[PDB]
Structure 1
């Protein structure tokens, strides 16, 4: 019945749906019901899409940001296949017609009714794009393999779609009654509070009277705040901090002064507080659900009788350029004076205007919101700024989502990590961002995939557990089939957790080979073989993890014993030979963010025609200190290469030549030049990427080389110079760039040219990183917690410099890095 979906969702999110009901909360109850009906509307629209439109849902195109190639094509009900000489500039339609003419001769007797599936994968090639503009063809051309595609008819694609179906009057000062506590401490107890509107204060922070660590301490004091009640903004947020004194932080707690129906909150409130590292504005406005052992304040918010926030209709009724590109009071007031001409001539400066409006005075808010509701939509870049906690107001928030609707699915994917973390800054469950992310997730299954996992990865955190569970529950109402697909993934990871816990215990007692043999026995059980096999990869749902290749599975010797899990496929061939690494015990978010930013750098470089040959490999947290990492096969560490062990192809007279002999052995004869280029390009990319991102602790063990020449980085424990990390040039890579010559300035200075181009391209999108890192502060990443972390980026890119000045400064750091190389 309905009941089976509920128990499946419950298992899928790690939080039973009985628990949502047991709160008796009207906001939860109205989120669930209102978002259920919204996601079910999507699910209906989804099942009546056309077959091409369904491919757009299920397998959205992997596109890149003349010349010949072999393509091998087959038809779905056949092993008999054909090979074709085609051009890289031809459409899929041209190729599909080629296939049908070779079939109509072999079988002796329309291209529009087909889609090319990438063999043994959930990737499809269709639409009016040249072959080399598809990521599969482009990947294939660099790596050198023949494409393997399959003609899938529309009736068979529709068969897939089928089987997935489901007010101003009050001028008194705002005040409270601080009643009492119920907590523990080692002195006297002070309760400082404050009215914040985002980061900014609506008035100074009024303390409570000092009182002894008496219980369960009692106060029964008025606190009177320096602000009229009519001047409270819609997102007025009252923020407490309980600490002790003769500073000693103990707890904190926030709540919105207006409830989710716009009503002002009266009367009594028990705030269940959270422990501390004093006053914490951006902290969540929901209480600690650990009600048993939580320090709890009770307070009263005076009755003033039922007063709702004014409806929008009521609100709407009620030297200049030189600065506009931190400002002084007169400059702020000149920016406010000319607010109408900001709307008319400089609409991209909305943010700076929003940071000069007095949010603690209500006429100014209406005068602002009046400008805001006719304000033209801004570019995607500008809207990512307005999502930050710096702009808490709902109309500004709702305006931002309105300017972000024109995000492409690829862009939305690009920023999905950051957008999810902004859900933590949200004050209420039902919000324009949630609905936006949910509606786009339900319109694109890849977006839907990754939204699920970004949320599912944080259910171990009580502050977001309720929000995230509910969103996940809503998504599942709107995609029964993808729920089941994801359960299969989660069942795989449950088994990997249990197999990894075995491997840890075992490794501490017996030898490496005997633990590996005993891992393989455990995997060869029905329950494991079934669970570990025949799923989609959480790292990339278009990757199919088919036959778990137990022989080649192992574990790595590092402290947490990450498992090495290899998968094969009959239908896919070499594309089906894929590896994943399950790591349990480490917080992979730090890594994931670092790889996504390098991926973005790659995207931004390719958009200016620069292909530095990066390796943007999957990294995805899936659970508490648990996640997956995509295996880049056919690669080894600089450490393992430079070991220089004998009876190998890299038998080297000098350790400087170990890499170059290694590259030689893997790329013999004419192909050595192609790999040194791959190496050089990739070396330059990661050199810049590490310098901008401030990635420290780089040694041979955590730098890998692919057998193509491509270099890339692993293990991102520290970033943004969290030990001012300088540019890193390594002699043995310099040796490879220079083709093993001691003096080869032409090949070396090309590499400086690549590094400089790469560095100047990121400086132009400096604001994109600044905005995206600003939104990431929401995550509570230990090394992304303050302004000096964001200042690192500003200084690494040199964002307040002229392009000429910054390039001069970059070349100092580069020449310094060159000197350091021996």
Structure 2
């Protein structure tokens, strides 16, 4: 069984477990045993949890960031159901007693022993929250559909839990010997070396002597820094380039190992190719030893010297600026550091930036303040996870302040926290143990941590780190490994089906490709792999029987698949679709959609519901991923074709959109449809302007039958093609209820745009911190400070609320002038 689990982990993570052992790396070996021990303890705690505590793990509550409603309730082993009239203010327990009292009269004879399952979903309704606070009830209330629930007894949940079982003395200046290389280029060869502490240099960069294009240097490179003054997280960086500039390769290493021991002596650096020095770049060598440009260096023996333990470390106008600073101002913050600890604890980041990291006495003074520093709010701690703060004690403190994150906040910031892993110097770190610990305690967290790691396994710079964490997670949850394998087997089938479709679309017509896609899908191996799985887009969503006749593909470049599903146990809530796309990098789309979803959350918290469509987008592999289908939706371009023999047929093109909404929302329903349109139109106008989303045409703008407008295919953001505010006449027309002049409706829309924008301005620092953490991903449109500047300008964060509002009204007016 121990061998079968090992072979299943290897197929799941995409890398054989034997390859980790073939490295013989003591750091990899220590990480593997420690994290396995950590994850098995987590697994042991889980198998003994209470049935309510198991529901919290397995099905964490989906809550929103008086009025009467009908609710259908049945029992597990019964087709019989009772429709009850309840209130939005009523609690699950009250509904459960109604269900048990109705069963008492039917069967002729405790709600504390039950939970409510959402029919055909891995979602439950429980705890002291009124029905309207559950995301599922909210969806039901807005759509006008009846919530369907199942009374699940505590014994049936226990049965699920059960079936799911498993030093200062060295004053000499730091120096290295540069022995030789073994590369390929056209000219002379120079090795530029630098000592860095994050983005900041610990001294000036020291260049090599020019050698003609196996180059041998055998030269001594000396740095303007003493050996005692090197911080624990000191990073030695190298860049190889050609001179007549021409970058070739780059390589980095930590001066201290994973056991705090200063490194000696000879080292071979397997360099990485270039697009001069790259401090943010990984500290592990290129695994392609065959075709990698190498560099041999000698680290002189200063003798065994370790980095001092914390016990040894511990022994050894101010307000007008504190909201980039001058040399005198830095000295002001440094001298008054005890007053920063006492009266301004949230100004920790500015204090860490003014400390001389190249001086061990300033670091020991800094760290002494840190070990007695009060816990910072979650917003402050996210700023400290940035590569601008590379110290291990600073990182350990940042995680300590992030422990108070709820599972919903951590789900919100999960993507950024996974990208911080790419900045880590060692395998065994506090962020990994925190992420692993929160993943093992929350099945939905576990789910997305797996997929964020798995989607990057084709990248060699992270393949070892990500594969080790995933193996660690699998030791902690054998059942979820099996669940995740069913997902990967479906994606393996979708990839092969998409490949046939890509080839077929160029040889024959769509009717013949679709019919031959269906026959391929109808094969037993396909029918088995594509059916009865949890959605990678959302674990609470169950993809039951694949609806072959309803499956197709889209006509865009990559020929993406349209896969439909149906469930008897869920009814109409089980009618779901997934889009499979292979050939495009989906990382940027996922980031864009996460940011919009965050905006929606922030607006909802201030009571502003702009009726957004935050549909799922998940990378799953190399240029592979899934998109959640938003049912009953069509593109503006498709509506605007103004096709004949339709109810949406218009006398003027400007009217097609309104007639379509009129056809989908007859009589009294059109008023709500216009309202949904205006609200969502205000949210997406603010979302695109803030995020610099350009190249917006009728083909990448969609509409739901409800009126809800949404955006698709986000390949560009943060101005990268300054995008102006955009207003379309066709949408102004629907807002103005079709009427030529309707200032009442238009300025009510302008009001919504202003409200949406000022709320996001108040959380502008949260966007700035998350986008800075996102720089670690390596996105081409999120590489430098000029991309981050774009958000400072769009949100006008350097202004007062009054000055920023006049400026937004300037951009909104300029956009109205552009509209015809």
TM-score by length of 1: 1.00
Residue 651 of structure 1, CA deviation = 1.2
CA distance in structure 1 between the aligned counterparts of 2:714 and 2:108, rounded to whole angstroms: 59
Cα deviation per residue 1:276-324 (whole Å; 9 max; x = unaligned)?
A: 0110000000000000000000000100111000000000000111110
CA distance in structure 1 between the aligned counterparts of 2:319 and 2:5, rounded to whole angstroms: 58
The answer for the alignment partner of 1:242 in structure 2 is 240
The answer for the alignment partner of 2:767 in structure 1 is 769
CA distance in structure 1 between the aligned counterparts of 2:2 and 2:182, rounded to whole angstroms: 42
How is 1:164-175 mapped onto 2 (pairs within 5 angstroms)?
Answer: 164-175=164-175
CA distance in structure 2 between the aligned counterparts of 1:583 and 1:462, rounded to whole angstroms: 23
Cα deviation per residue 1:27-74 (whole Å; 9 max; x = unaligned)?
A: 000000000000000000001000000000000000001000000000
Partner-residue secondary structure (3-state), 1:203:
coil
**Pick aligned residue for 1:546 from 544, 547, 552:** 544
The answer for the alignment partner of 1:677 in structure 2 is 675
Residue 4 of structure 1, CA deviation = 0.8
Cα deviation per residue 1:233-281 (whole Å; 9 max; x = unaligned)?
A: 0000000000000110000000000000000000000000000011000
Residue 25 (structure 2) pairs with residue 25 (structure 1): yes
CA distance in structure 2 between the aligned counterparts of 1:147 and 1:364, rounded to whole angstroms: 62
- Alignment coverage as a number of residue pairs: 820
The answer for the alignment partner of 2:322 in structure 1 is 324
CA distance in structure 1 between the aligned counterparts of 2:9 and 2:695, rounded to whole angstroms: 42
The answer for the alignment partner of 2:793 in structure 1 is 795
Residue 624 of structure 1, CA deviation = 0.2
Cα deviation per residue 1:528-568 (whole Å; 9 max; x = unaligned)?
A: 00000000000000000000000000001000010000000
CA distance in structure 2 between the aligned counterparts of 1:767 and 1:205, rounded to whole angstroms: 33
Cα deviation per residue 1:390-416 (whole Å; 9 max; x = unaligned)?
A: 000000000000000000000000000
CA distance in structure 1 between the aligned counterparts of 2:722 and 2:692, rounded to whole angstroms: 7
CA distance in structure 1 between the aligned counterparts of 2:245 and 2:343, rounded to whole angstroms: 49
CA distance in structure 2 between the aligned counterparts of 1:185 and 1:476, rounded to whole angstroms: 44
Partner-residue secondary structure (3-state), 1:614:
coil
CA distance in structure 2 between the aligned counterparts of 1:782 and 1:523, rounded to whole angstroms: 37
Partner-residue secondary structure (3-state), 1:185:
coil
CA distance in structure 2 between the aligned counterparts of 1:377 and 1:280, rounded to whole angstroms: 32
CA distance in structure 1 between the aligned counterparts of 2:69 and 2:774, rounded to whole angstroms: 43
CA distance in structure 2 between the aligned counterparts of 1:374 and 1:113, rounded to whole angstroms: 46
Residue 114 of structure 1, CA deviation = 0.3
Residue 678 of structure 1, CA deviation = 0.3
The answer for the alignment partner of 1:368 in structure 2 is 366
CA distance in structure 1 between the aligned counterparts of 2:323 and 2:275, rounded to whole angstroms: 36
**Pick aligned residue for 2:724 from 700, 715, 726:** 726
Partner-residue secondary structure (3-state), 1:752:
helix
Residue 372 of structure 1, CA deviation = 0.4
Partner-residue secondary structure (3-state), 2:209:
coil
CA distance in structure 2 between the aligned counterparts of 1:189 and 1:55, rounded to whole angstroms: 62
Partner-residue secondary structure (3-state), 2:413:
helix
Partner-residue secondary structure (3-state), 1:181:
strand
Residue 437 of structure 1, CA deviation = 0.2
Partner-residue secondary structure (3-state), 1:700:
coil
CA distance in structure 2 between the aligned counterparts of 1:130 and 1:191, rounded to whole angstroms: 66
**Pick aligned residue for 1:268 from 266, 273, 283:** 266
CA distance in structure 1 between the aligned counterparts of 2:149 and 2:783, rounded to whole angstroms: 47
CA distance in structure 2 between the aligned counterparts of 1:25 and 1:566, rounded to whole angstroms: 46
Residue 731 of structure 1, CA deviation = 0.4
Moved over 3 A (4+): none
CA distance in structure 2 between the aligned counterparts of 1:12 and 1:144, rounded to whole angstroms: 41
CA distance in structure 2 between the aligned counterparts of 1:188 and 1:389, rounded to whole angstroms: 33
CA distance in structure 2 between the aligned counterparts of 1:539 and 1:727, rounded to whole angstroms: 32
CA distance in structure 2 between the aligned counterparts of 1:370 and 1:378, rounded to whole angstroms: 17
Residue 442 of structure 1, CA deviation = 0.2
CA distance in structure 2 between the aligned counterparts of 1:575 and 1:208, rounded to whole angstroms: 66
Cα deviation per residue 1:82-117 (whole Å; 9 max; x = unaligned)?
A: 000000000000000100000010000010000000
CA distance in structure 1 between the aligned counterparts of 2:269 and 2:166, rounded to whole angstroms: 40
The answer for the alignment partner of 1:122 in structure 2 is 122
Cα deviation per residue 1:427-473 (whole Å; 9 max; x = unaligned)?
A: 00000000000000000000000000000000000000000000000
Aligned residues: CA RMSD: 0.4
Structure 2: which 5+ runs fail to align?
none
Partner-residue secondary structure (3-state), 2:389:
coil
Cα deviation per residue 1:351-400 (whole Å; 9 max; x = unaligned)?
A: 00000000001000000000000100000000000000000000000000
Partner-residue secondary structure (3-state), 2:191:
strand
Partner-residue secondary structure (3-state), 1:595:
helix
Residue 617 of structure 1, CA deviation = 0.2
CA distance in structure 2 between the aligned counterparts of 1:536 and 1:315, rounded to whole angstroms: 50
Partner-residue secondary structure (3-state), 2:630:
coil
CA distance in structure 1 between the aligned counterparts of 2:808 and 2:337, rounded to whole angstroms: 39
Partner-residue secondary structure (3-state), 2:489:
helix
Cα deviation per residue 1:668-692 (whole Å; 9 max; x = unaligned)?
A: 0001010100000000000000000
Residue 2 of structure 1, CA deviation = 1.0
Residue 815 of structure 1, CA deviation = 0.3
CA distance in structure 2 between the aligned counterparts of 1:144 and 1:414, rounded to whole angstroms: 28
Residue 348 of structure 1, CA deviation = 0.2
Residue 738 of structure 1, CA deviation = 0.6
Residue 164 of structure 1, CA deviation = 0.8
Residue 655 of structure 1, CA deviation = 0.6
How is 1:244-393 mapped onto 2 (pairs within 5 angstroms)?
Answer: 244-393=242-391
Residue 578 of structure 1, CA deviation = 0.2
Partner-residue secondary structure (3-state), 2:207:
coil
CA distance in structure 1 between the aligned counterparts of 2:797 and 2:28, rounded to whole angstroms: 43
Partner-residue secondary structure (3-state), 1:268:
strand
The answer for the alignment partner of 2:470 in structure 1 is 472
CA distance in structure 2 between the aligned counterparts of 1:209 and 1:89, rounded to whole angstroms: 77
Partner-residue secondary structure (3-state), 1:462:
coil
Partner-residue secondary structure (3-state), 1:596:
helix
How is 1:661-700 mapped onto 2 (pairs within 5 angstroms)?
Answer: 661-700=659-698
CA distance in structure 2 between the aligned counterparts of 1:406 and 1:108, rounded to whole angstroms: 49
Residue 634 of structure 1, CA deviation = 0.3
Cα deviation per residue 1:756-791 (whole Å; 9 max; x = unaligned)?
A: 000000000000000000000000011100000000
CA distance in structure 1 between the aligned counterparts of 2:740 and 2:263, rounded to whole angstroms: 75
CA distance in structure 1 between the aligned counterparts of 2:167 and 2:673, rounded to whole angstroms: 70
CA distance in structure 2 between the aligned counterparts of 1:396 and 1:139, rounded to whole angstroms: 42
CA distance in structure 2 between the aligned counterparts of 1:422 and 1:641, rounded to whole angstroms: 43
Partner-residue secondary structure (3-state), 1:220:
strand
Residue 747 of structure 1, CA deviation = 0.6
Residue 515 of structure 1, CA deviation = 0.4
CA distance in structure 1 between the aligned counterparts of 2:679 and 2:304, rounded to whole angstroms: 66
Residue 463 (structure 2) pairs with residue 459 (structure 1): no
Partner-residue secondary structure (3-state), 2:182:
coil
Residue 695 of structure 1, CA deviation = 0.2
TM-score by length of 2: 1.00
The answer for the alignment partner of 2:200 in structure 1 is 200
